[PDB]
């Protein structure tokens, strides 16, 4: 896999930001995890730290999987890095998401992934908790 730039236009929600990659407003989902929606319990807090963790990134940068790169809804599919730390894989380490939509060929994170969960879950955290 290989790292692309992108610049933050606005948070959205846990799982989901709104990113310009070549050049264009697009919406992206976090590939692999599942946050909670903001009505729900750590919905907020979910957001919270992705609102945080993009917001003050210097170098926002995009990483397509193998497989699609758009999923149906026209949401890039990517793992998103913010100055070089996996917004996925520090949700799922907070217990902030769980480990979750993991479809072939887009999922080569995912033993990394659920590693975290496994952390998160030990420690009792958030939806862990
Ligand atoms: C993360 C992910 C979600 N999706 C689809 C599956 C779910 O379809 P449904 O809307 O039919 O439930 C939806 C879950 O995203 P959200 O958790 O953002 O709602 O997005 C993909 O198709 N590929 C993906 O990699
Ligand atoms: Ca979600």
Same mark, same amino acid.
């Given at each position: 896999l290989h790292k692309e730039p992108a610049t933050l236009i606005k948070a959205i929600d846990g799982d989901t930001v709104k990113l310009m990659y070549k050049g264009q407003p697009m919406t992206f989902r976090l590939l692999a995890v599942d946050t909670? /929606?903001?009505? @729900? &319990?750590? !919905?907020?807090?979910?957001?919270?730290? $992705?609102?945080?963790?993009? @917001?003050?990134? &210097?170098? +926002? /940068?995009? @990483?397509?999987?193998? !497989? *699609? =790169?758009?999923?149906?809804?026209? =949401?890039? %599919?990517?793992? +998103?890095?913010?100055? !070089?730390?996996?917004?996925? /894989?520090?949700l799922v380490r907070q217990g902030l998401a769980k480990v979750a939509?993991?479809?072939? !060929?887009?999922? $080569?994170?995912? *033993? %990394? %992934? =659920?590693?975290? @969960?496994?952390q998160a879950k030990k420690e009792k955290l958030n939806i862990w908790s």
């Open positions: 909670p /929606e903001f009505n @729900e &319990k750590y !919905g907020p807090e979910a957001s919270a730290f $992705t609102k945080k963790m993009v @917001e003050n990134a &210097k170098k +926002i /940068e995009v @990483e397509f999987d193998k !497989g *699609q =790169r758009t999923d149906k809804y026209g =949401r890039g %599919l990517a793992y +998103i890095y913010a100055d !070089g730390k996996m917004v996925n /894989e520090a939509y993991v479809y072939k !060929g887009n999922n $080569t994170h995912e *033993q %990394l %992934l =659920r590693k975290a @969960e496994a």
